[PDB]
Structures are given as structure tokens and as C-alpha cells.
Amino acid sequence: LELRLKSPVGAEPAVYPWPLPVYDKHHDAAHEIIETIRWVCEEIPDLKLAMENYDYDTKSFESMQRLCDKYNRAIDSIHQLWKGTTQPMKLNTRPSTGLLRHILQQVYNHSVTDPEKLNNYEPFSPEVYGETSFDLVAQMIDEIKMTDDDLFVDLGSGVGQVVLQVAAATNCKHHYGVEKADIPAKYAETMDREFRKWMKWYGKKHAEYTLERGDFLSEEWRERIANTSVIFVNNFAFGPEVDHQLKERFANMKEGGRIVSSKPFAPLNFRINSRNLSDIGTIMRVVELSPLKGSVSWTGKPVSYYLHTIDRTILENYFSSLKNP
Numbered sequence: 001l002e003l004r005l006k007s008p009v010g011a012e013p014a015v016y017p018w019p020l021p022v023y024d025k026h027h028d029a030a031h032e033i034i035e036t037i038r039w040v041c042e043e044i045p046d047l048k049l050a051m052e053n054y055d056y057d058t059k060s061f062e063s064m065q066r067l068c069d070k071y072n073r074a075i076d077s078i079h080q081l082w083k084g085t086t087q088p089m090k091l092n093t094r095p096s097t098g099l100l101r102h103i104l105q106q107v108y109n110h111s112v113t114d115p116e117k118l119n120n121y122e123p124f125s126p127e128v129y130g131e132t133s134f135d136l137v138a139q140m141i142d143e144i145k146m147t148d149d150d151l152f153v154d155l156g157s158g159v160g161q162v163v164l165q166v167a168a169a170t171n172c173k174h175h176y177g178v179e180k181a182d183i184p185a186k187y188a189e190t191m192d193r194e195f196r197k198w199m200k201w202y203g204k205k206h207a208e209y210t211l212e213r214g215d216f217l218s219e220e221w222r223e224r225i226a227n228t229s230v231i232f233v234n235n236f237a238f239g240p241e242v243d244h245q246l247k248e249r250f251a252n253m254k255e256g257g258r259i260v261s262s263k264p265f266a267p268l269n270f271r272i273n274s275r276n277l278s279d280i281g282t283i284m285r286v287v288e289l290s291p292l293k294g295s296v297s298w299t300g301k302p303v304s305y306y307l308h309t310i311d312r313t314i315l316e317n318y319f320s321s322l323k324n325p
């Protein structure tokens with residue numbers, strides 16, 4: 001027994017077993033199915049017209065299969081439309097924000113087979129797992145205009161969702177994620193396959209990326225970090241040991257290089273005095289990113305992210321001013 005959904009662009013149908021699996025307390029395949037249909041209607045207006053003319057109950061196989069079938073018919077229909085004088089949909093675009101949210105949720109669901117195993121890290125160590133919200137990454141994408149000049153790195157990439165979202169959204173020459181712990185790195189290998197497959201299924205283009213197992217403190221990474229123009233690092237749980245080593249790594253970045261983190265690498269109020277010349281604040285502007293409305297962590301205050309920009313002008317100027325009355 002099965003349910004099937006035709007790709008709007010001709011890829012292999014998506015096949016779901018019956019009964020449909022549950023993912024967590026508010027995610028099951030039934031809603032995935034419904035939502036994928038909902039989203040393809042969003043991408044193809046004609047499909048939506050063809051689809052308007054309908055009830056459905058998530059628990060009934062016939063009721064579900066009548067929906068899958070109704071959608072599969074309409075796809076056949078649209079494909080016939082495209083053989084006519086009508087042009088195909090825009091052939092290879094970036095996904096809308098909404099579609100992207102769904103796609104990554106879909107990818108996660110099919111890959112992170114057991115979400116609870118992602119809590120099996122050593123507590124109060126740099127291994128602590130946390131997931132940056134899609135909206136936040138969205139904000140970063142919006143505020144940090146990136147081009148094909150840029151290279152992107154998520155240090156400690158988890159299962160890799162930041163990389164995937166950024167790769168979906170921007171045109172960086174390449175995007176990297178590096179993660180050290182087995183569990184998330186294992187899952188990342190699946191995330192990668194699934195993301196590639198789902199993007200093909202919806203016919204959406206994405207930039208190039210690689211999810212790697214490794215240590216971002218190793219020798220190899222020193223140089224790699226220096227060539228990176230944009231770095232995302234969710235370091236809230238790193239601790240001063242690891243933060244300090246990262247400061248050294250960052251000291252080597254090119255002008256205009258950018259780092260986005262959850263905990264600043266230099267105080268915000270930083271004036272360069274006589275005693276702090278060696279310090280990382282000397283070479284970078286640091287701003288707080290605007291909080292997203294209605295957003296409160298366990299800290300009661302809004303969750304903050306910080307943007308750092310390599311600006312050695314700051315240093316140049318303090319030296320220049322050491323030659324003035």
C-alpha cells in the first residue's frame with residue numbers, strides 16, 4: 001500500500017508508505033503531503049486553478065489517495081498544457097522563502113530519523129547541540145548581501161541546515177559546513193542527499209555546497225578560515241577556550257570579511273586604549289542584529305545575533321592619532 005506524488009518537473013514521484021509515519025508531536029507525513037501539494041500550487045498558478053474545484057481526512061487511505069490522485073491528474077494536465085503553446089514554468093529559479101522553509105522541514109523529516117539522538121552530546125562542553133531558527137538565518141541572508149565573490153562557512157554546522165538554506169538563497173562560489181560530532185555529521189550525509197533530491201523534485205536551483213566532518217580548529221582550517229569572506233558560527237555554548245582560538249583564526253581574515261555569531265567576539269562598546277592593541281576588537285566593527293518581533297528564548301530577553309566586519313581602519317586611525325596633540 002502506497003501514496004504517490006508526481007514531481008511538477010518530471011522527476012521520480014515521491015512515494016509514501018501507508019499508514020503514514022509520524023515525525024514528532026506536530027509533524028506527520030500526512031501534513032507533509034498536503035503541504036507539498038499546497039506549495040506546488042503556489043509555484044504553478046495554473047495548477048492552483050486546476051486544483052481549486054474540491055474535503056479530506058488525514059486518517060483515511062482512500063481520502064488521502066483521492067487527494068494525491070486529484071493532484072497527480074492536474075500535474076498530467078499542466079504538463080500537457082506545457083506541450084501546447086504555453087511556456088513551461090520558470091525553469092530553474094531560487095525558491096520563495098515559504099517554499100524553502102517547507103523543503104528544509106521536509107528534508108529534516110526524512111533525514112533526522114531519530115531527533116532525540118541529537119541530545120546525546122556531553123553537557124557543558126563545546127558539543128552542545130542547538131538549531132538556529134530559519135527566520136534568523138533568513139534575516140542574516142537579507143542583511144548580509146552576498147555575491148559570487150563570497151565563500152560561506154558554518155563552523156559547527158550540525159546536521160547542516162544553515163548551509164542548505166544559505167545555498168538555496170545566495171550565489172556564493174561555494175558554501176561549507178564543518179561539524180565534529182558523529183551523530184549530527186552522520187545525519188548531515190543524509191540531509192545532503194535529501195536536499196539534492198527534493199530540490200530536483202521541485203525543480204529549484206541552489207548554489208554549490210559541501211557538508212564535511214572535521215575539526216574547525218585543526219591546521220587545515222586555519223588557512224581555510226582566512227580565505228572565507230562570510231562565517232556563520234553559533235558559538236553560544238562554546239566557552240572562552242574555544243572562543244579565544246577562534247579569535248586567532250579570525251585575525252587572519254581579509255578586510256571586509258564578516259562573521260555572524262550568537263555571542264560577540266569583541267565587546268560592543270570597544271574603544272581602543274593603550275592596553276588593548278593586541279585584542280580582536282582592534283580590527284572589526286561589531287553590531288547587534290535587530291531582534292525579530294516576538295522572539296524570546298529561555299533568557300526572557302530576545303535572542304541576539306552579532307555581525308562582525310573586519311575593519312583595520314580602526315587600528316590605522318588609532319596609530320595616526322598617536323601623532324596628534
Ligand SMILES: CN(C)C[C@H]1O[C@@H](n2cnc3c(N)ncnc32)[C@H](O)[C@@H]1O
Pocket residue numbers: 126127128129130131155156157158178179180181184214215216217234237
Ligand atoms: C550549536 N551547534 C549547532 C554547534 C555545533 O558545533 C559543533 N562543534 C563544536 N566544536 C567543533 C569543532 N571543533 N569542529 C567542528 N564542529 C564543532 C558541535 O558539535 C555542535 O554540533
